[PDB]
Amino acid sequence: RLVKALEDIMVHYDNTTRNSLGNVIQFIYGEDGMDAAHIEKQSLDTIGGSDAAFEKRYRVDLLNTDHTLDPSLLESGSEILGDLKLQVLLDEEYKQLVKDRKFLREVFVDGEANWPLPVNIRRIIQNAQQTFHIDHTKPSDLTIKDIVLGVKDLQENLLVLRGKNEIIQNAQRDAVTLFCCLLRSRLATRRVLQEYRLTKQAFDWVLSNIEAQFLRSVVHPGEMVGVLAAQSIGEPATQMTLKKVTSGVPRLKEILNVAKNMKTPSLTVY
Amino acid sequence: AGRAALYKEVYNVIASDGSYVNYRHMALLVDVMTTQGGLTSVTRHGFNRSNTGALMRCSFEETVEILFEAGASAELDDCRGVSENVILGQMAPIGTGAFDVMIDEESLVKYM
Amino acid sequence: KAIPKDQRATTPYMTKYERARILGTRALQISMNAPVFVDLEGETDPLRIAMKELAEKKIPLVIRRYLPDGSFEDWSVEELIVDL
Amino acid sequence: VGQQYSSAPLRTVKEVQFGLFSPEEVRAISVAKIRFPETMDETQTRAKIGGLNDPRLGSIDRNLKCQTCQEGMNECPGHFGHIDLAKPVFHVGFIAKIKKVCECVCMHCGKLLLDEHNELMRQALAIKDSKKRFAAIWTLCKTKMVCETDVPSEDDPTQLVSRGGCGNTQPTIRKDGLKLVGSWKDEPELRVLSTEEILNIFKHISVKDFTSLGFNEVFSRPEWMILTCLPVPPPPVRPSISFNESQRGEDDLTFKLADILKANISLETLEHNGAPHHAIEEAESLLQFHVATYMDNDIAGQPQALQKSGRPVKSIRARLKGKEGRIRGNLMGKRVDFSARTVISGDPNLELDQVGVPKSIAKTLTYPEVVTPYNIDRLTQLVRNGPNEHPGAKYVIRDSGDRIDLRYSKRAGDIQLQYGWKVERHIMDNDPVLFNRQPSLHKMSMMAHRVKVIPYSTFRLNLSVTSPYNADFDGDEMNLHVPQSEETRAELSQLCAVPLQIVSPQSNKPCMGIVQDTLCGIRKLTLRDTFIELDQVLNMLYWVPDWDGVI
Amino acid sequence: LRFGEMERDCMIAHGAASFLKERLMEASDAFRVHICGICGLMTVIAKLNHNQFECKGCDNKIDIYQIHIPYAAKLLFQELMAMNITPRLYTDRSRDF
Amino acid sequence: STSTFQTRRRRLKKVEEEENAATLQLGQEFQLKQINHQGEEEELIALNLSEARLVIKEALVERRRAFKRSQKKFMHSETREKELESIDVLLEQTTGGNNKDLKNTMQYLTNFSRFRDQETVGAVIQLLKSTGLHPFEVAQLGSLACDTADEAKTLIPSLNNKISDDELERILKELSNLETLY
Amino acid sequence: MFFIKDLSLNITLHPSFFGPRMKQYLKTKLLEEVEGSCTGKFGYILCVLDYDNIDIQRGRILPTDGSAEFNVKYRAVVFKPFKGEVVDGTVVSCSQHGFEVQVGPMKVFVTKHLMPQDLTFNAGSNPPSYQSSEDVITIKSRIRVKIEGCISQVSSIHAIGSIKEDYLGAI
Amino acid sequence: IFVYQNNITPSAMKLVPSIPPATIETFNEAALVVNITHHELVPKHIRLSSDEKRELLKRYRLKESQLPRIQRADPVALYLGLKRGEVVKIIRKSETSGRYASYRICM
Ligand SMILES: [Zn+2]
Ligand SMILES: [Zn+2]
């Protein structure tokens, strides 16, 4: 059944999920437009961790002897301390990582931080590391602008939908949102310089890769996602070889049938 | 909210076995079962009554019964359905066939 | 209905299904004694020549992309980027 | 396909228009009078009588003639015949509606039973959907049992407006066997609704009435749900089976027609002979029966029309019913050529993406290559080699659409190839093929492998690609299909090849791994405890084929 | 050997359009019938020789097509017609969308 | 076949195919309101002999030319009986050589023709095209000798009431006047 | 009467000819399967105009073999007679049952009894003819006929015409 | 908007659709004790201007019928009072991408 029920469904060139009529089913395959294949469990560091740790890790204040980047990291470090026009970028960045937090904590209440997402950034850097034999001793050479102003310019090229209007170029920001959070998370000034001493080279590379490795994870207009989805479920429904409620195969049967008289009706009230 | 439940429930039927399935799939299904209006069942009594052409619903549980009432009310079939084409021996609009390929005679000159 | 080469909206990149079919299609022709637009570095397997024509982007074909409502967009093997 | 060329342009089916046959067309189309019920024997003489099957329909006996249409057997689809009934009959599957329609319209003047006037009605006549605009109307008229002459307009319930006339009460109706009956209400009045009647009331129904009801002026008018002229499927739909000559072999269908025919003539010869008025409607049921069973046999009205020996009878419907039949078991899935199956076994010496094809099969299965300067040589060699040695071939085909059977033909070793000709050759090392293990319920239950011709008799697949097919070697069998178009292969190697299937989307993670020996063993070999000495280390190195030669 | 529902469902999955058609046609059924561009039926009396074509009833000689379809399907249709139902085969879409 | 600029949505019952006659009722394929490829509307195209002779010639010629643009890698002279040869050549060059029809169309078209100058034929057109008359008439008129309104309005009944005898007669006067000699 | 109708055709091209000058081959094949053709719905396709600006559009590649299919949109000079059309031609054949006049690419025949009365048929003539008080009709003589009815057939179109009306006869 | 307690008389209710344009709606006390829109599950909806709508179609090249629908009786549809034809934009959270925009036309 599952199969006969979704044959006709596939991802159409506009990046919508429709059947044989034209009826939209998903306006973006998987609420994100990514081909399941290109996805891995990553961690949204921004979420978990005391309000304390957060600061000590993502906070940068160029107007303070103890909350600034020690020049032992940035080439133009000593000549930054105090600069007021930077502290605004630096502060924008933080009032954002901050928004990200709340946002995430509004979506994933559990506090669970590990989720499937496109482009494995953890590893994308790991390579950058030993690919330029980055030494943890000497300092970087990134302008604070270099960083914060490229991370932004990055998000700009992570296109899923391409439309030439608003209603479309707006769904865009959406289908990406979750990703960027992870993104802004891993490419935060402090981090970028204190944890993984990237040079400008390393960075500009880490950036190129992400963009293209992302544009690869998109979903190909052609995939017959309907059938797929079906199988993906029915399949593991065959490997099912069998705390006191209707559970499993007989259940799944119930569900699909939209049965009114379920053996177990339960209901949890908090 | 219902969808959110239908999904949630279904998800629990696959997790209770320690197996993992990527959202998107159960999502899609849960969605198919819900767009239309309320709760459309994955059964002969539901999704097999929808505006989908005849020949497609033909290939499932009511066959002749469904065909009969097709010439009766003179239905028209788009032949946009997977099944449809399969029955005709035609290349269906699926992956490899979600488009057409042409010989641009123009570019077929600068190539020499 | 058609669509101007501008206002274009599809994916700048070639879909696997496309490329897959182009090579095939192209092979088929090459295998049929169609003219080959690249120097055969000595190749002799059509689908292999096809892989070559496709890397020097010298395949004279055009992928018409029908949309859900019928309108289409036309891209050339030339244009379309090939990551994969 | 078919062979022989046709100046007829060629297209693809784009729309499918489902209609109902108008006795009128049915006639037009036919080429067969079909008056007799017999089969052939023009007084035992073999051939066929201008009676049933071939009063010009298709043919048999390997003889051109198909209404001069020649071409013979293969290439002459059937050519429908017709057979004028004696009296109108119901359409076994439509009965259900023919009824519901009458309960929707009253006889005598034949017209709707609710017009724009009744308000609850308007809201129904707007529902754009013949499938619901009907199951609505009906629900509103099944109750009305009086063909009203005047109703209270959009104004005063005092004032009464006039429309159609004849308040002849409407009778409720029930289904008894293959006939419709209704009462007219002190005390009821039960009479049988003669087909001959229904037809009429329908014939008269209005054009905007058709449509208002789920119908279509051009393709399906209700008056057609009632059969008057019966199409007669030609041989190919109901072919025979000869045991050479002087015997039989007729198909089940060719009998219910034979029946229907009998039951049709017996009737007729009564309306023109001693017609004992109501001793006829006892043989008009028989027709209604046959002309009904012919199409359906699994009714609730019991009698299965068991054919001598108590064998059920294959109603046309039955041939299409789910599974094992046409739709589901012939069209949605088929037996196919260029396919092999045997037992599978592990062989830790094949690359992942390969698959051991036994020589026996590599020599059986073939691939149509097209002669090209690039190959000519290689190809002529295979052709020279013959269909018995391995790397060889077994069929050459020139432009003239003729098969040269390499195993016979006095020109076996001769032949000069011609650019354009094709050479069915043997499957060879590296021809991509689709391998698979039923039950198929994964993209991966079917993947493409590199063919590696090997001895002995078993498909030898790599171990790690085991779990996707979900197979054991405890005697499990697998199927192999062989591509055919240079573009066909393309689709296998570019989307179906195993290496591509490695990371499964059904669970955004890889789907093949390392098991048994390799696994178990890979651990031991790892341990801090485990040390290896020169003599071996060296061999091990040698085994990894991509070793850079740097001890 | 068998290439049934399930094995199809996978090719659709794979998105292997052509290969599917191939198993389904060129490697099994495959048949060349004629139609009337008027009444979408197999009626047509093709004498592939003297090119004569006709189709009395809808009466033609000019508007005629040739299509390739799985014999099983032809039969599906013929069987349907015999049950008095008409399967129209048209080579052009007039309903749009 | 050779398809024709409009897809007449044939709904099964193909029956009504009217009569073909000088009632100006010509096959559906020849109404006066047909469609051009560009997708526009355009009056029918009525060619009167010796106008056709020029149009056929025109292309058959510009054909020979562009038929040599690729081989690298108002008066004339009384080409009568002279034109019979001068054309047979244009053919044995740019024709199918098995177009016995065209040969025979060029003879007829060139023997019965009534004009030699694309200038004379030009006026013929600039004249009749003021009538509002339908193309098939504005053709039969151009390629048919006519002295009286009767010889006309009889061999072209579709005229009968669409024009006074007097006028249709002036036009006939100016026809034999322009009628190039031989 | 002769027309210039806007037509279009479909040519299936084998990959073989997918050359550099394909356009060339197409056109050429257009002209082989058109100039000299005949239909009841178009009449006589006599000549393709504007050889140059012939629109080819983009052709699509079929799907089993590589043959591509282009819808060639052209324009040409056609000619299909009608019932009630008045045209004059050159006589060709003349027998006891009548003479056949040749109007253009077509051949219209006139029945002895579809002619007038005072006109008889002289068999003992050479070449064969039809005599009258003052008129003499034979081989090369030019006549003006009124087409009474048409009949389409294979690759041609014949038709019967009369010379029994007025302003009809020789010229 | 009228609020009945235990119920209304079936003789009464059939008097609402008798004075157009004007529109009326009927709500039981017991169903308004809790705002259904505050429930963990039910995400927030939004009415779309007959302008914002005629746009949603033009941007997805959609026909009205190919759009995901919501019931005329659907709880939330009443909380906002939709009308056969009015479209709603459903904006919810997603474990695949924070926010997902969806639409529901009415029937
Ligand atoms: Zn025949
Ligand atoms: Zn009545």
Curated annotation (Swiss-Prot), chain C:
Describe the protein's quaternary organization and the partners it interacts with: Component of the RNA polymerase I (Pol I), RNA polymerase II (Pol II) and RNA polymerase III (Pol III) complexes. Component of the RNA polymerase I (Pol I) complex consisting of 14 subunits: RPA135, RPA190, RPC40, RPA14, RPB5, RPO26, RPA43, RPB8, RPA12, RPB10, RPC19, RPC10, RPA49 and RPA34. The complex is composed of a horseshoe-shaped core containing ten subunits (RPA135, RPA190, RPB5, RPO26, RPB8, RPB10, RPC10, RPA12, RPC19 and RPC40) where RPA135 and RPA190 form the DNA-binding cleft.
MF GO annotations: DNA binding; DNA-directed RNA polymerase activity
Q: What else is known?
A: Present with 6090 molecules/cell in log phase SD medium.
What Gene Ontology terms describe where this protein resides (cellular component)?
A: cytoplasm; nucleoplasm; nucleus; RNA polymerase I complex; RNA polymerase II, core complex; RNA polymerase III complex
Q: Which family does it belong to?
A: Belongs to the archaeal Rpo6/eukaryotic RPB6 RNA polymerase subunit family.
Q: What is this protein called?
A: DNA-directed RNA polymerases I, II, and III subunit RPABC2
Where is this protein found?
Answer: Cytoplasm; Nucleus
Specify where the region named Leucine-zipper lies, as residue ranges.
40-61
What part of the entire protein does this chain span? 72 to 155 of 155
Q: Which domain of life is it from?
A: Eukaryota
> Which GO biological-process labels does this protein carry?
nucleolar large rRNA transcription by RNA polymerase I; ribosome biogenesis; RNA-templated transcription; termination of RNA polymerase I transcription; termination of RNA polymerase III transcription; transcription by RNA polymerase I; transcription by RNA polymerase II; transcription by RNA polymerase III
Check the UniProt entry and state the signal peptide residues, or none.
none
Curated annotation (Swiss-Prot), chain D:
Query: Which residues of this UniProt protein bind Zn(2+) 2?
Result: C106, C109, C147, C166
Subcellular compartments: Nucleus
Signal peptide residue numbers: none
- So where does Mg(2+) 2 get bound? D472, D474
As for PTM, the annotation reads:
The tandem 7 residues repeats in the C-terminal domain (CTD) can be highly phosphorylated. The phosphorylation activates Pol II. Phosphorylation occurs mainly at residues 'Ser-2' and 'Ser-5' of the heptapeptide repeat. The phosphorylated form of Pol II appears to carry, on average, one phosphate per repeat. The phosphorylation state is believed to result from the balanced action of site-specific CTD kinases and phosphatases, and a 'CTD code' that specifies the position of Pol II within the transcription cycle has been proposed.
Q: Where do the segments described as Rudder loop lie?
A: 297-314
The region called Lid loop is annotated at 239-251
Q: Which positions in this protein are listed as binding Zn(2+) 1? A: C66, C69, C76, H79
**Superkingdom of origin:** Eukaryota
Residue positions binding Mg(2+) 1: D472, D474, D476
> What does the UniProt function comment say about this protein?
DNA-dependent RNA polymerase catalyzes the transcription of DNA into RNA using the four ribonucleoside triphosphates as substrates. Largest and catalytic component of RNA polymerase II which synthesizes mRNA precursors and many functional non-coding RNAs. Forms the polymerase active center together with the second largest subunit. Pol II is the central component of the basal RNA polymerase II transcription machinery. During a transcription cycle, Pol II, general transcription factors and the Mediator complex assemble as the preinitiation complex (PIC) at the promoter.
Q: What is this protein called?
A: DNA-directed RNA polymerase II subunit RPB1
From Swiss-Prot, chain E:
Give me the residues that bind Zn(2+), please.
C36, C39, C55, C58
Places the protein is found? Nucleus
Q: Which residues form the signal peptide?
A: none
Zinc fingers classed as C4-type: ranges? 36-58
Assigned protein family: Belongs to the RNA polymerase beta chain family.
What else does the entry mention about this protein? The binding of ribonucleoside triphosphate to the RNA polymerase II transcribing complex probably involves a two-step mechanism. The initial binding seems to occur at the entry (E) site and involves a magnesium ion coordinated by three conserved aspartate residues of the two largest RNA Pol II subunits.
* Assembly description: Component of the RNA polymerase II (Pol II) complex consisting of 12 subunits.
> Function of this protein?
DNA-dependent RNA polymerase catalyzes the transcription of DNA into RNA using the four ribonucleoside triphosphates as substrates. Second largest component of RNA polymerases II which synthesizes mRNA precursors and many functional non-coding RNAs. Proposed to contribute to the polymerase catalytic activity and forms the polymerase active center together with the largest subunit. Pol II is the central component of the basal RNA polymerase II transcription machinery.
Q: What is this protein called?
A: DNA-directed RNA polymerase II subunit RPB2
Swiss-Prot record, chain F:
* Residue numbers spanned by region Disordered: 1-20
Localization, per the record, is: Nucleus; Cytoplasm; Cytoplasm, P-body
**Pfam families xref list:** RNA_pol_Rpb4
Single GO biological process annotation from the record: transcription by RNA polymerase II
GO molecular function, a single term:
nucleotide binding
Top-level lineage group: Eukaryota
* InterPro entries per UniProt: HRDC-like_sf, RNA_pol_Rpb4/RPC9_core, Rpb4-like, Rpb4/RPC9, Rpb4/RPC9_sf
Q: Which SMART domains match?
A: RPOL4c
Task: Read off the PANTHER family from this record.
Answer: DNA-DIRECTED RNA POLYMERASE II
Function text: DNA-dependent RNA polymerase catalyzes the transcription of DNA into RNA using the four ribonucleoside triphosphates as substrates. Component of RNA polymerase II which synthesizes mRNA precursors and many functional non-coding RNAs. Pol II is the central component of the basal RNA polymerase II transcription machinery. It is composed of mobile elements that move relative to each other. RPB4 is part of a subcomplex with RPB7 that binds to a pocket formed by RPB1, RPB2 and RPB6 at the base of the clamp element.
Q: Which family does it belong to?
A: Belongs to the eukaryotic RPB4 RNA polymerase subunit family.
Protein name, per record: DNA-directed RNA polymerase II subunit RPB4
| Species per Swiss-Prot/TrEMBL record | Saccharomyces cerevisiae (strain ATCC 204508 / S288c) (Baker's yeast)
